[PDB]
Enzyme design. Structure first.
Site, mmCIF file in Angstrom:
data_model
loop_
_atom_site.group_PDB
_atom_site.id
_atom_site.type_symbol
_atom_site.label_atom_id
_atom_site.label_comp_id
_atom_site.label_asym_id
_atom_site.label_seq_id
_atom_site.Cartn_x
_atom_site.Cartn_y
_atom_site.Cartn_z
ATOM 1 N N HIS A 154 0.812 -1.195 0.000
ATOM 2 C CA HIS A 154 0.000 0.000 0.000
ATOM 3 C C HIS A 154 0.875 1.288 0.000
ATOM 4 O O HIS A 154 0.458 2.284 -0.568
ATOM 5 C CB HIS A 154 -0.975 -0.020 1.167
ATOM 6 N N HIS A 176 -0.386 -12.440 -2.794
ATOM 7 C CA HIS A 176 -1.445 -13.339 -2.282
ATOM 8 C C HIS A 176 -0.980 -14.753 -2.140
ATOM 9 O O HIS A 176 -1.779 -15.569 -1.807
ATOM 10 C CB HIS A 176 -2.711 -13.189 -3.137
HETATM 11 C C1 HEM Z 1 -5.574 -6.296 -7.829
HETATM 12 C C2 HEM Z 1 -4.747 -5.866 -6.856
HETATM 13 C C3 HEM Z 1 -5.066 -6.239 -5.496
HETATM 14 C C4 HEM Z 1 -6.263 -6.313 -4.817
HETATM 15 C C5 HEM Z 1 -7.614 -5.910 -5.240
HETATM 16 C C6 HEM Z 1 -5.921 -6.667 -3.514
HETATM 17 C C7 HEM Z 1 -6.818 -6.846 -2.516
HETATM 18 C C8 HEM Z 1 -6.528 -7.145 -1.184
HETATM 19 C C9 HEM Z 1 -7.499 -7.194 -0.109
HETATM 20 C C10 HEM Z 1 -8.966 -6.808 -0.177
HETATM 21 C C11 HEM Z 1 -6.806 -7.665 1.037
HETATM 22 C C12 HEM Z 1 -7.461 -7.882 2.421
HETATM 23 C C13 HEM Z 1 -7.296 -6.768 3.458
HETATM 24 C C14 HEM Z 1 -7.698 -7.317 4.805
HETATM 25 O O1 HEM Z 1 -8.974 -7.578 4.812
HETATM 26 O O2 HEM Z 1 -6.899 -7.573 5.700
HETATM 27 C C15 HEM Z 1 -5.447 -7.849 0.614
HETATM 28 C C16 HEM Z 1 -4.500 -8.496 1.447
HETATM 29 C C17 HEM Z 1 -3.165 -8.661 1.081
HETATM 30 N N1 HEM Z 1 -2.662 -8.308 -0.125
HETATM 31 FE FE1 HEM Z 1 -3.629 -7.737 -1.773
HETATM 32 N N2 HEM Z 1 -4.577 -6.983 -3.408
HETATM 33 C C18 HEM Z 1 -4.047 -6.537 -4.560
HETATM 34 C C19 HEM Z 1 -2.715 -6.606 -4.897
HETATM 35 C C20 HEM Z 1 -1.700 -6.880 -3.956
HETATM 36 C C21 HEM Z 1 -0.264 -6.800 -4.292
HETATM 37 C C22 HEM Z 1 0.322 -6.196 -5.541
HETATM 38 C C23 HEM Z 1 0.367 -7.235 -3.169
HETATM 39 C C24 HEM Z 1 1.812 -7.320 -2.919
HETATM 40 C C25 HEM Z 1 2.790 -7.674 -3.708
HETATM 41 C C26 HEM Z 1 -0.603 -7.614 -2.173
HETATM 42 C C27 HEM Z 1 -0.391 -8.223 -0.944
HETATM 43 C C28 HEM Z 1 -1.340 -8.531 0.020
HETATM 44 C C29 HEM Z 1 -1.044 -9.282 1.213
HETATM 45 C C30 HEM Z 1 0.239 -9.916 1.618
HETATM 46 C C31 HEM Z 1 -2.243 -9.375 1.816
HETATM 47 C C32 HEM Z 1 -2.533 -10.057 3.143
HETATM 48 C C33 HEM Z 1 -2.555 -9.227 4.398
HETATM 49 C C34 HEM Z 1 -2.533 -9.904 5.759
HETATM 50 O O3 HEM Z 1 -2.090 -11.068 5.812
HETATM 51 O O4 HEM Z 1 -2.854 -9.185 6.787
HETATM 52 N N3 HEM Z 1 -1.826 -7.486 -2.714
HETATM 53 N N4 HEM Z 1 -5.383 -7.774 -0.771
#
Ligand code: HEM
Ligand code: HEM
Ligand SMILES: [Cl-]
Ligand SMILES: [Cl-]
Ligand code: NA
Ligand code: NA
Lengths: 713, 713
Positions: free
Chosen positions: A77, A244
């Site tokens: 972010h 993810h």
């Molecule tokens: C289409 C692009 C993406 C969408 C729509 C998206 C969406 C989201 C959403 C909705 C969450 C959940 C937030 C929560 O409820 O805790 C999240 C979690 C996360 N996203 Fe994404 N994401 C995107 C791209 C990315 C990218 C580019 C990365 C990093 C390289 C990333 C890494 C993460 C990680 C590691 C989590 C997990 C957080 C946790 O374990 O607390 N995401 N994503």
């Protein structure tokens, strides 16, 4: 308390040019963050960070016992606000900790992530900025979980106030498209310079476009917003799938349980927000996005399980406990671990946007190659993560510390090393004399150097005269740069350079990048001479010439000046008044209001206008460096009216006789209209100002010439 | 473009503390306006101004052939925005030229007056500020017209952006009382700190209160608003009758003819506004207030005709050509000259507010005395005009040029000249040792010096430690100043001073004002020693002791701190949150956000709180100068909640045990909440920061101690 912006909401706002003053900065005037960081024990910081990953705090317990996923999310972010259109956003100023980003809905509970890092920030103090620390924490997360990163550079100095960025015009968080301040028009065309689909999101809506859970259509939004962040399809797939790989989303109960974002929260919250009334409000009961997805069987370890799952199951739509749309593999076995209860397992789940990587046909090709060849996935993700987190850091000369990657990447607009002796003061004088003897005019010399230098933007530290990219595609053909005139100037300069370099011993040579800037200095010096003043304009050698093969043409497009008030240029007809676009460009050039004012009035009389337009050339001695712009603009003997042909062009006529004296644009006449700008113009239009005007012009000119010279920092 | 103030309209605004940065200032960092002025040929400027008086320009022709009335009105409006409650407004910054004042309805057509002056401003450049020039022009007008002024001082440096002043909450210009944002409540009680009856007016409505033409009720508003500008009845009558001895009002047609104010006008207006469609738009056809009154038979010459007419006729209510209420002399002959047509004469006329001077019984006694004794009128008006135009200039040490009146006036809060040798560094050491050996504590010494110094306000440059007024009425009895504790400190210091002074040769003596400040320095030094640091605090002698007779008790009342977050003090319960009051006080003290931060955190641990409160004293070593405030405020091991008894007091408890660690107010906890203040606190609460905190504290301490030291400027 009623303010000037309430009474006159459309007046031009200059406060954007005086942010970041020494008044708001707690550090001393001589503090140099690079010097602090260079002595940080980066290895010790990283050990502390590795220990933190598995050291749960009861006020925000770690999922799976490991904060890695939360920290990777925090770092993405931090970087994910960047927009190529203007360079604003990105991780490089640590702005996630200030309003409004600290309180965007997509940033929910990243306030907890930042707070977990205070002990380490406190321990190392000024030697590590927040801005570096957010990124370094994401790298340590990845490394702790078994992922080999591409490297890391420090050097992001902290800032002390919010930047002024246009994030949209919506007055409702998350507003769906089609409203009164819609950022979409036409066939789902997002307005420049935005790069997110809704106000408060990072790129796209994880449920689908305006909440419609169609993976195919979600993929169109992914593609568009990631492109506006300078990422292509390979990079985008690698980033989403890579991210993810880790962690989970949080949506344990209804969203109505979640309270005020941090900027709205009570003082007792001490800078945290989103307090939840659902059960314990944290941990197993956490609510962040409202989705409840865990992608892989090992959320705390790097794997290739994201693509194993994506391709290996068929997916059905369902709802999370908060009511959001998401997908489940029914009749998979319960193979995904629970975050807190070792006796519970779950079926595989996916977001709409994750399924885009399979159901968009171009993405599926790439996803399938990454599924079958997870070493290719890991390399692509490592490369894309370094790009994501360093895209706004500027030239490689800014990169600090022991982990900088040696490989030079096309996206960094790389400048070749200089391996030869540089010209000295006497050589510079000889070249200035040669240039002036060639017959190139003051106007030609100033306009060429301005064209070269003024592509710099402080938002992402891209552009500037180093590299002599003016001579290459696509800058050589930008309309603002007057391609035929430019080509004739550059031919003349290249002949001068070839002659000088041919005459040297000892390996001494001058680059064309340095000669373009030195020639503009000679134009300025000659213009001062034309006005009867002897001045030396400072000049610092050491620029190098990049090749066409070292220049990504598509990525350079966003640096084209389509509005450059300094050259009275507007490429077409925009909704935004031209004077607003001038202040924008001044902010990108890092100029204060006084510096913008002196610079513009000098450029007018030097002949820097595109097309040799007479608009704003309020002098009868063009190509002399005088304060005539100001003296003539402020003369009450002249009366100004918009023309019948064009309401944005103005005629200045003698008030007594009606005789036509001048023409001007809104950019010219704002300096006689705006009450703050006119106070500035008055200083430089006063009878005692000729010396001041010349000194301040030369200083600002030199400042613009040196914007990208982080080799001299 | 949605901004942080749109999303979070009640978040605290720190940008007020970083106005006036070097970024917005066109003059170089070392520019010193007093030095420039001192070399101006003021006599030459005054000859130019006398010439201008009858140099009529066609775009705004001079009434009667003489701009003197317009310019007196211009100078009185410059000065007439001043409010004693906070010191803000007044003539001393030249704020008339910026928003919003440039566009207040009561300032209509003063943009013409300022533009008449541009040639003179231009001629003299930086050696005469606009702020000095507006006032000097008013003096020249008076002198041109036959009135001998009391004198003039230069020294008002120009500013470069609008000051942040609370002018009211109404969202409609001129709104009458009792609206949703009414500035009145009760029995016509005007809200502090306001000193005007309607948004966009100077003091009162010339038609009467809320437009009702009752001279007696008008007089109540006059008395109240003039008192809120530091004027008593004699001064108020002298000013109004004196002003209205000259010139005329303008109301030749309906006000619907008049167009946009300057900040709203088109760019082609070039900084002017109120363009009128009525006839020629100017001169004989001018429309400014809508009233059409000419007070005397010789509007371009000083006379005794104002009071001759006021008492010599009975008055009938009538309407101007624009429909405003005004008064005409019953049965009178047409004796008043027309401004442009030698063949036309007019009956005597008056405003409602002029008739106040006859119909209010206290005013009538004064008016009658001035009518009978016109030399008394002339002396009173000269004295009042000098006070009006200099009330915000500060100590007489700031007054520059050859026309400064020698007479010292009570309202100047005069400081006696020093006529003896000052203590040297050896003597300062000896006195600091005596102070520490008396038994006075760190808390006592710091609190006393802070009480003495922190009355300063930069708005009007009143207050500060010079004078030793802390020992006089009324400061010795202010609640904030802890009267019984203060009396014991002062007694001990007066004994030390008497002993030192008794032992000297050669006329050397220390003032109590210097000893108070030096004793505070000794307390800071002791506190640093308590914490293990070796610190010398700078001290500059030279303050003198003012007498009670030199100290107007009523005028000093507006300087009482009823909110001082630096001492965790609030006198009562206000509508405005306490953290907003802190930022206000920091702005009056001329502090930036980092300086405010460091100074508060230090004062808390030194024992500066009123009443020895523990609120915010986040240390186990009170009276030692450490950064403990910041380290303990930012410790996430502590959880904060508002108390049941008082929602504005918070308890901080150990998050694991529930044990009570600290208590704090909103002023204390805002440093852990507001995202910009928390960023600052983090710098000072870091492990590398203890030395930086001490050094920065000593610097801000000395800054505050020296705020009024214009004798050293
Ligand atoms: C289409 C692009 C993406 C969408 C729509 C998206 C969406 C989201 C959403 C909705 C969450 C959940 C937030 C929560 O409820 O805790 C999240 C979690 C996360 N996203 Fe994404 N994401 C995107 C791209 C990315 C990218 C580019 C990365 C990093 C390289 C990333 C890494 C993460 C990680 C590691 C989590 C997990 C957080 C946790 O374990 O607390 N995401 N994503
Ligand atoms: C109760 C306080 C006062 C009220 C309500 C008031 C009201 C006004 C108004 C309504 C005008 C007419 C504006 C126009 O239409 O051009 C005016 C003009 C003027 N006032 Fe006042 N006045 C006040 C006090 C002062 C004082 C204290 C002075 C100066 C010492 C002053 C000096 C002038 C002069 C010289 C003019 C004539 C302007 C010209 O000739 O253009 N007035 N007054
Ligand atoms: Cl930004
Ligand atoms: Cl002010
Ligand atoms: Na940026
Ligand atoms: Na003031």
């Amino acid at each position: 308390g009623t303010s000037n912006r309430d009474w006159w909401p459309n007046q031009l706002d200059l406060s954007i040019l005086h942010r970041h003053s020494s008044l708001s900065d707690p550090m001393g005037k001589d503090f140099n963050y690079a010097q602090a960081f260079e002595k940080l024990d980066l290895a010790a910081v990283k050990r502390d960070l590795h220990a933190l990953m598995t050291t749960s705090q009861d006020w925000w317990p770690a999922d799976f016992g490991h904060y890695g996923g939360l920290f990777i999310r925090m770092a993405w972010h931090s970087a994910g606000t960047y927009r190529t259109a203007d360079g604003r956003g990105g991780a490089g100023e640590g702005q996630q900790r200030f309003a409004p980003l600290n309180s965007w809905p997509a940033n929910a509970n990243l306030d907890k992530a930042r707070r977990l890092l205070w002990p380490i920030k406190q321990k190392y103090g000024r030697a590590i900025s927040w801005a570096d620390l957010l990124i370094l924490t994401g790298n340590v997360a990845l490394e702790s979980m078994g992922f080999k990163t591409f490297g890391f550079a420090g050097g992001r100095a902290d800032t002390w106030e919010p930047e002024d960025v246009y994030w949209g015009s919506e007055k409702i968080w998350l507003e769906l498209s089609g409203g009164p301040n819609s950022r979409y028009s036409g066939d789902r065309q997002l307005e420049n310079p935005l790069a997110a689909v809704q106000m408060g999101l990072i790129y796209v809506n994880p449920e689908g476009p305006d909440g419609n859970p169609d993976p195919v259509a979600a993929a169109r939004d992914i593609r568009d917003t990631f492109a506006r962040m300078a990422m292509n399809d390979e990079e985008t797939v690698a980033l989403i799938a890579g991210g993810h790989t880790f962690g989970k989303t949080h949506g344990a109960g209804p969203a109505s349980n979640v309270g005020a974002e941090p900027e709205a929260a009570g003082i007792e919250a001490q800078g945290l927000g989103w307090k939840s009334a659902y059960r314990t409000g944290k941990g197993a009961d956490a609510i962040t996005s409202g989705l409840e997805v865990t992608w892989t069987t090992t959320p705390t370890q790097w794997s290739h399980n994201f693509f194993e799952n994506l391709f290996g199951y068929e997916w059905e739509l369902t709802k999370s406990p908060a009511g959001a749309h998401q997908w489940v593999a029914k009749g998979a076995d319960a193979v995904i671990p629970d975050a807190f209860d070792p006796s519970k397992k779950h079926r595989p789940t996916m977001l709409t946007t994750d399924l885009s990587l399979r159901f968009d046909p171009a993405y599926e090709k790439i996803s399938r190659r990454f599924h079958e060849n997870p070493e290719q996935f890991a390399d692509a993700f490592a490369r894309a993560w370094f790009k994501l987190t360093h895209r706004d850091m500027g030239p490689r000369a800014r990169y600090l510390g022991p982990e900088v990657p040696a490989e030079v990447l096309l996206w960094q607009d790389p400048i070749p090393a200089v391996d030869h002796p540089l010209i000295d003061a006497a050589d510079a004088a000889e070249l200035k004399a040669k240039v002036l003897a060639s017959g190139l005019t003051v106007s030609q010399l100033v306009s060429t150097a301005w064209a070269a230098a003024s592509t710099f933007r402080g938002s992402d530290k891209r552009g500037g005269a180093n590299g002599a990219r003016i001579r290459l595609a696509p800058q050589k053909d930008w309309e603002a740069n007057q391609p035929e005139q430019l080509a004739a100037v550059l031919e003349t300069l290249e002949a001068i350079r070839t002659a000088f370099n041919g005459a040297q011993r000892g390996g001494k040579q001058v680059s064309l990048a340095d000669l373009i800037v030195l020639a503009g200095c000679a134009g300025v010096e000659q213009a001062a001479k034309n006005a009867g003043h002897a001045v030396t304009v400072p000049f610092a050698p050491g620029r190098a010439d990049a090749s066409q093969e070292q220049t990504d043409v598509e990525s350079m497009a966003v640096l084209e000046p389509v509005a450059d008030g300094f050259r009275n240029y507007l490429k077409g007809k925009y909704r935004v008044p031209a004077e607003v676009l001038l202040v924008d460009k001044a902010q990108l050039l890092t100029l204060s209001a006084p510096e913008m004012t002196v610079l513009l009035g000098g450029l007018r009389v030097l002949g820097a206008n595109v097309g040799q337009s007479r608009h704003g050339v309020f002098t009868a001695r063009e190509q002399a460096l005088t304060n005539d712009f100001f003296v003539n603009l402020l003369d009450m003997g002249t009366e100004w009216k918009p023309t019948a042909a064009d309401a944005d062009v103005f005629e200045g006529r003698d008030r007594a006789t009606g005789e036509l004296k001048w023409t001007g644009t809104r950019v010219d006449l704002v300096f006689g209209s705006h009450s703050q700008l006119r106070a500035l113009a008055e200083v430089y239009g006063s009878a005692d100002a000729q010396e001041k005007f010349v000194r301040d012009f030369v200083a600002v000119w030199n400042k613009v010439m040196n914007l990208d010279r982080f080799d001299l920092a």
